Swiss-Prot record, chain B:
Citrullination at Arg-3 (H4R3ci) by PADI4 impairs methylation. Demethylation is performed by JMJD6. Symmetric dimethylation on Arg-3 (H4R3me2s) by the PRDM1/PRMT5 complex may play a crucial role in the germ-cell lineage. The modification N6-butyryllysine is found at K5, K7, K8, K23, K36, K69, K71, K83. The modification N6-acetyllysine is found at K5, K7, K8, K23, K51, K71, K83. The modification N6-propionyllysine is found at K8, K23, K36, K69, K71, K83. There is a cross-link at K83 (Glycyl lysine isopeptide (Lys-Gly) (interchain with G-Cter in ubiquitin)). The modification N6-lactoyllysine is found at K5, K7, K8, K23, K69, K83. The modification Symmetric dimethylarginine is found at R3. The modification N6-methylated lysine is found at K12. It is found in: Nucleus; Chromosome. This is Histone H4. The keyword Cell wall biogenesis/degradation does not apply. InterPro entries: CENP-T/H4_C, Histone-fold, Histone_H4, Histone_H4_CS, TAF_TATA-bd_Histone-like_dom. The modification N6-acetyl-N6-methyllysine is found at K5, K7.
Curated annotation (Swiss-Prot), chains C, D:
Belongs to the histone H3 family. A lipid is attached at C72 (S-palmitoyl cysteine). One of its GO terms (cellular component) is nucleoplasm. Its main location: nucleus. The chain holds residues 40 to 136 of 136 of the full protein. GO terms for molecular function: DNA binding; protein heterodimerization activity; structural constituent of chromatin. The nucleosome is a histone octamer containing two molecules each of H2A, H2B, H3 and H4 assembled in one H3-H4 heterotetramer and two H2A-H2B heterodimers. The octamer wraps approximately 147 bp of DNA. It comes from the Eukaryota. This is Histone H3.2. The modification N6-acetyllysine is found at K18, K41, K77, K84. The modification N6-(2-hydroxyisobutyryl)lysine is found at K18, K26, K41, K84. The keyword S-adenosyl-L-methionine does not apply.
UniProtKB/Swiss-Prot annotation, chain E:
The keyword Transcription regulation does not apply. Core component of nucleosome. Nucleosomes wrap and compact DNA into chromatin, limiting DNA accessibility to the cellular machineries which require DNA as a template. Histones thereby play a central role in transcription regulation, DNA repair, DNA replication and chromosomal stability. DNA accessibility is regulated via a complex set of post-translational modifications of histones, also called histone code, and nucleosome remodeling. It comes from the Eukaryota. This is Histone H2B 1.1. Glycans are attached at S94. GO terms for molecular function: DNA binding; protein heterodimerization activity; structural constituent of chromatin. There is a cross-link at K102 (Glycyl lysine isopeptide (Lys-Gly) (interchain with G-Cter in ubiquitin)). Keywords: Acetylation, Chromosome, DNA-binding, Glycoprotein, Isopeptide bond, Nucleosome core, Nucleus, Phosphoprotein, Ubl conjugation. Pfam families: Histone (PF00125). Monoubiquitination of Lys-102 by BRE1 gives a specific tag for epigenetic transcriptional activation and is also prerequisite for histone H3 'Lys-4' and 'Lys-79' methylation. The lineage of its organism: Eukaryota, Metazoa, Chordata, Craniata, Vertebrata. The modification Phosphoserine is found at S4. SUPFAM superfamilies: Histone-fold. GO terms for cellular component: nucleosome; nucleus.
From Swiss-Prot, chain I:
Core component of nucleosome. Nucleosomes wrap and compact DNA into chromatin, limiting DNA accessibility to the cellular machineries which require DNA as a template. Histones thereby play a central role in transcription regulation, DNA repair, DNA replication and chromosomal stability. DNA accessibility is regulated via a complex set of post-translational modifications of histones, also called histone code, and nucleosome remodeling. This is Histone H2A type 1. One of its GO terms (cellular component) is nucleosome. The modification N6-glutaryllysine is found at K84, K107. InterPro entries: Histone-fold, Histone_H2A, Histone_H2A/H2B/H3, Histone_H2A_C, Histone_H2A_CS. SMART domains: H2A (SM00414). Belongs to the histone H2A family. The modification N6-succinyllysine is found at K84. The modification N6-(2-hydroxyisobutyryl)lysine is found at K25, K63, K64, K84, K107. It is found in: Nucleus; Chromosome. GO terms for biological process: heterochromatin formation.
Amino acid sequence: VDNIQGITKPAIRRLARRGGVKRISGLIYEETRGVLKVFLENVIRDAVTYTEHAKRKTVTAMDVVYALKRQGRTLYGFGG
Amino acid sequence: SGRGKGKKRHRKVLRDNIQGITKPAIRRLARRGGVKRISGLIYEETRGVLKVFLENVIRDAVTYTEHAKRKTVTAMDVVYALKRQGRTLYGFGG
Amino acid sequence: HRYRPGTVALREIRRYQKSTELLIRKLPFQRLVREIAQDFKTDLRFQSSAVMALQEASEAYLVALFEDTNLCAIHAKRVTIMPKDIQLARRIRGERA
Amino acid sequence: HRYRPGTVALREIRRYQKSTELLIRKLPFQRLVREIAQDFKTDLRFQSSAVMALQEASEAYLVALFEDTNLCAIHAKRVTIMPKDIQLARRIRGERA
Amino acid sequence: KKGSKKDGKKRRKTRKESYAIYVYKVLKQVHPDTGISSKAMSIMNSFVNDVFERIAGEASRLAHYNKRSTITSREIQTAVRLLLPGELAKHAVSEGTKAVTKYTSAK
Amino acid sequence: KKRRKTRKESYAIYVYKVLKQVHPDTGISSKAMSIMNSFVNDVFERIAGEASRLAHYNKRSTITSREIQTAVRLLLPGELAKHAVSEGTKAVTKYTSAK
Amino acid sequence: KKRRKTRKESYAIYVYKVLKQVHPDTGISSKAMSIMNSFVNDVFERIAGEASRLAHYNKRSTITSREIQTAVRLLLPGELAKHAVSEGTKAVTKYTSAK
Amino acid sequence: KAKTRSSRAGLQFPVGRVHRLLRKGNYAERVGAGAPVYLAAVLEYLTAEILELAGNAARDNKKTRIIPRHLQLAVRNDEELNKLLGRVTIAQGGVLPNIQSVLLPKKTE
Amino acid sequence: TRAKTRSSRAGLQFPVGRVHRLLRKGNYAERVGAGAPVYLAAVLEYLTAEILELAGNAARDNKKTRIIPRHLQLAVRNDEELNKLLGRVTIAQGGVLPNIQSVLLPKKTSK
Amino acid sequence: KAKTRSSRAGLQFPVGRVHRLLRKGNYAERVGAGAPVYLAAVLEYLTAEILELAGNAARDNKKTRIIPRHLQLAVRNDEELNKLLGRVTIAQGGVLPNIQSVLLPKKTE
DNA sequence: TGCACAGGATGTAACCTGCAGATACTACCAAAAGTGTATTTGGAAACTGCTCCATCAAAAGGCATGTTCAGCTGGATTCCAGCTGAA
């Protein structure tokens, strides 16, 4: 009522580990939050543009799938 | 003036033309790219990268040419090939 | 008993590269998403799968970016990733550029 | 009289970044295009603007790649580009891996 | 005859249209004493055709996603918001809206 | 029972049939099947889109098997394209020599 | 014209058809085609011979697709066997679900 | 309906549906009869290639049911599928195990 | 009394009729409403004006009265939004923006 | 003769001939109907594998016509075909270029 | 100072079972799909106008090549403050 601060240092470290990273600078965490916020702003902006065009009040998985696709980040698994 | 079949007809074997992309030329491209110092192995590396780039664009351009039943590669065949590879080019039509 | 610095980091890399579970907590992520969306259109609702699609896409994006960032750190003869490595990777990708 | 190492290189960067003329010689580039094409399909002819289009695209591609490569050399605390810098830029770009 | 011809008009060339006369008209509005080379005009023609295709493609997808068989100014407007960056989309949307409102104010 | 019956089709039953021909004793989760449905839909769109542009470029109002073939060659990597082309050509031949 | 017509059959026209499906613009010399005919005849004999022994070992007077399959698995190296089995199973399924 | 077009084409994928989708997709004014057959065959072939590889992956992981992980393993370990799906994200797919050599124990080796 | 091109009717320089025909010829949808080509022509006209405004400025800055590809490239690359819109586009004979990385400049006067 | 068995099986290889050859080969008292179909399919598949590789070899040698040399190159450079034909001699096939390292100029290197 | 052996910890195995989730069977139906026939038409053939591509010629100077020389860069080494990992 954190939010971007809610994406924790430990979750970021985990993401980095899956990315093969062994050692992390203390400044990486805030940097990562900034980058993640930009990514979401970009994808959500387009998804909401599709939502509004449809005259809907609910963002659907398809709105997100279409937004991701036009940003060159096609996601499989959510087209039901 | 509309007669023939070749006849007088040229076309020598083409080989090693990647060496036509010279050290001075690559140095100039690197300079426009803002590069101040270049290792000696950069030249052959750059030729290799350009060859791949050209092979890819030309492969698609010729595919467009052949699909259209033509024997001549058009600037449009190149523009469409570039576009489909995400290298849109303005200035040559389309 | 103490494992040396790096031994557990390596164990975590192997653990996480073997699994597929989302790595960011669900609720904190959902909150972030709703907050960002509220900036574009107020009073929106989200299908649960919309939020999940965004999390799957966001995590895949970050993990792949960390792989690139890691290559940049190693390129500079380091094993520690730094903000300049993330920045270099995004500039080359055309995200910053 | 001798200018110091680097002075003329900087002079050339300024010169070439101010101009737009193609930097590879025309005929040699045209033979490379013909050779490569020939290997894909014999008996092709080329509109001359098709060759100029390929040259314009090829040079813009190389120049932009040298810009990314330079960023990579600089990242490693060097001012000299090396094959590994080209390789890192192409890998981050997704042209390689 | 339809498609006649063949000192002039060698077996009528099929017409290749372009935005050149319109680009030229706009240029004079913004820079009355500035000209443009044919190569720069070829660049402008590519630019207009590229944006036309990008916006129309986006509008097409939008219509299909919504199971609509008609592309209206509303699909163009949304395609514009999706395709153009910030301020450009804002001014483009304003001009597009203004034009449709004017167009429909006649007759 | 046709109201909320707005038909939502997918390739799931056909993907399932193919899985049986290649791996008779293997199943597929729902999440995996949805990935497959997305896959087929994606490739369909890319190939159809490429076929569309090809026909437009050539001022043809018809998308024939020839455009599909050329689109396949442009879209798919080397070996994948060769076999895709071989399969496509086979189905059209069979289909043709078919009652 | 049937006298010296003692029919001498071979797989040449079928090998030719397959070459067209894999390499539309490639030909094959007569000597090469004879190598191919020998090849197909050889594999037929090895697979049939193996199927024969299998049935005999199991006291069965019938060689069914199951014996052909097992013979294939015994005779062919790893990957070759997997694809051969996949192709065999496909043809029998099609054939079955066929009018 | 004597024989379906798919049956006549020797296909499992729905030729009629592919025909209808091409027509409703606004790809072109007209769609020739062989186009949906050629395309259905390509779609079926690609599906078979990935299912074959994902099934092999499930099998290598001691499983009989293909899950997203197996599709990801199949695609990423395959040079050509990896390239075709180079800009695609398979949800719940994870990544391939891969640790840069320089990070392994004892300086760099 | 009705008329007058649709372009004049919409207050535009770009051709509404042509844009309508191109939209129909491109297979984007089964139908194209009357307002769609008007809106699209207005947008194309607007973007054209923006690039020409900046490009004429580049030509003036370089003491030229005729816009050439170079000026279009300078206009686009020096403008944040047009640069993004045209991020994956190459303008032939455009060259690049003058830009030398700081670390490459000489200094500290001394081997 | 409505449809040939090969057509019904989606095959180019002659199912009926394969059936007849199995029967006249004295392999077994009886031959089930699916046996010649399965076998014809395997024979066709193997033929396609070798022709694909020999065609690639012809192509690498600047030729459009496959000769024995190309079949030999194809088989010998393929681990599995090489093993299947490990005790087979392809006439006019020659051998693969191969010089033992120790025989190369400058002592052994 | 280096190599090998011994010891404690961690991970996987083999096995067992509840259950989320896959599966098998029946019922129903709109629309998906195929078949019959009647009309329209895209675009391949065939013929050839007309562009512009390949190629030749000759001249000459911009620019490539090959070499010398040494400035200063990259690469290697050493040291250690303090950041980052482990608990």
